């Protein structure tokens, strides 16, 4: 038995982008995925409504451009044997700072910490804990990057192991990378 | 080269 968890964010619809890539939408079939963890910056209810069609359980934290000011700034969600922390990440300066993310890991008391904002995918183990940034699922521009690849993450959780899949749109084709993490 | 991965959402070439 497994849990599938979709991890995505920084869509920036409607200001920076118009929609998810068509090839991504074709992959996200309703009913398949159990949980959605969204780093924020949807930035409107239209994208929230779309996420609700995909899974029964949708968790979203507040980004710096979200129009829904009621989203929580951070969240901790338990899926199977894993506690997962979620924050958008504009609060961390310098952006993506490893020492700050590791402090948040300890303070949230989580096995996996998910953050966004940078629009650059990351998935790595650091001091026996796992860190994910799904990137921007629409490939939305930012101020500090010259190339943003549309990206999202799927976690496949099985007992004390998670297999993290990253999906990227490169050219017009979907390509993937796979990273395994086991709790210590 | 021709490396591909199975995933729960389908089978795809490797990014790198």
Swiss-Prot record, chain A:
In the UniProt annotation, what is the result of changing residue 119 to A?
Loss of in vitro protein phosphatase activity
Q: Which organism is it from?
A: Homo sapiens
Which residues are involved in binding Zn(2+) 2? 41, 64, 88, 117
Positions of modified residues (N6-acetyllysine): 52
Q: Does the keyword Acetylation apply?
A: yes
Gene3D superfamilies, A to Z? 3.60.21.10
Query: What gene name is given for the protein in this entry?
Result: VPS29
State the family named in the UniProt similarity comment for this chain. Belongs to the VPS29 family.
Q: Which residues take part in binding Zn(2+) 1?
A: 10, 12, 41, 119
Changing residue 41 to A has the effect of: Loss of in vitro protein phosphatase activity
Q: Which GO terms describe its molecular function?
A: metal ion binding
What is the protein name stated in its UniProt record? Answer: Vacuolar protein sorting-associated protein 29
Expressed, tissue-wise, as follows: Ubiquitous. Highly expressed in heart, lung, placenta, spleen, peripheral blood leukocytes, thymus, colon skeletal muscle, kidney and brain.
The effect of residue 10 to A is: Loss of in vitro protein phosphatase activity
Q: Which CDD domains match?
A: MPP_Vps29
Q: Name one GO cellular component term.
A: endosome membrane
Q: Which UniProt keywords apply?
A: Acetylation, Cytoplasm, Endosome, Host-virus interaction, Membrane, Metal-binding, Protein transport, Transport, Zinc
- Give one GO biological process term: intracellular protein transport
What effect on the protein does mutating residue 41 to D have, as reported in its record? No effect on in vitro protein phosphatase activity
State its location(s). Answer: Cytoplasm; Membrane; Endosome membrane; Early endosome
Effect noted on mutating residue 167 to A: Impairs interaction with VPS35L
Q: What is the effect of changing residue 88 to A?
A: Loss of in vitro protein phosphatase activity
Phenotype when changing residue 69 to D:
Impairs interaction with VPS35L
Task: One Pfam family, please name it.
Answer: Metallophos_2
Q: What does this protein do?
A: Component of the commander complex that is essential for endosomal recycling of transmembrane cargos; the commander complex is composed of the CCC subcomplex and the retriever subcomplex. Component of the retriever complex, which is a heterotrimeric complex related to retromer cargo-selective complex (CSC) and essential for retromer-independent retrieval and recycling of numerous cargos such as integrin alpha-5/beta-1 (ITGA5:ITGB1). Component of the retromer cargo-selective complex (CSC). (Microbial infection) The heterotrimeric retromer cargo-selective complex (CSC) mediates the exit of human papillomavirus from the early endosome and the delivery to the Golgi apparatus.
**Summary of subunit composition and partner proteins:** Component of the commander complex consisting of the CCC subcomplex and the retriever subcomplex. Component of the heterotrimeric retriever complex formed by VPS26C, VPS29 and VPS35L; within the complex interacts with VPS35L. Component of the heterotrimeric retromer cargo-selective complex (CSC), also described as vacuolar protein sorting subcomplex (VPS), formed by VPS26 (VPS26A or VPS26B), VPS29 and VPS35. The CSC has a highly elongated structure with VPS26 and VPS29 binding independently at opposite distal ends of VPS35 as central platform.
**How does the entry describe its membrane topology?**
Peripheral membrane protein
């Amino acid at each position: 038995d497994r849990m599938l968890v979709l991890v995505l964010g920084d869509l920036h619809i409607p200001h920076r982008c118009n929609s998810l890539p068509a090839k991504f939408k074709k992959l996200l079939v309703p009913g398949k995925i159990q949980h959605i963890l969204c780093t924020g910056n949807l930035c409107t209810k239209e994208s929230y409504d779309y996420l609700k069609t995909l899974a029964g359980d949708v968790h979203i934290v507040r980004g710096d451009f979200d129009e829904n000011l009621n989203y929580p700034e951070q969240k901790v969600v338990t899926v199977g044997q894993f506690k997962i922390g979620l924050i958008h990440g504009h609060q961390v300066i310098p952006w993506g700072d490893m020492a700050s993310l590791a402090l948040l890991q300890r303070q949230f008391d989580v096995d996996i910490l998910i953050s966004g904002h940078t629009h650059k995918f990351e998935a790595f183990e650091h001091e026996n804990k796992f860190y994910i940034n799904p990137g921007s699922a629409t490939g939305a521009y930012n101020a500090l990057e010259t190339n943003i690849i549309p990206s999202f993450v799927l976690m496949d959780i099985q007992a004390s192991t998670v297999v993290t899949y990253v999906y990227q749109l490169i050219g017009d084709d979907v390509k993937v990378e796979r990273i395994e993490y086991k709790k210590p | 080269x021709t490396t591909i991965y199975w995933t729960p959402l389908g089978t795809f070439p490797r990014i790198r």
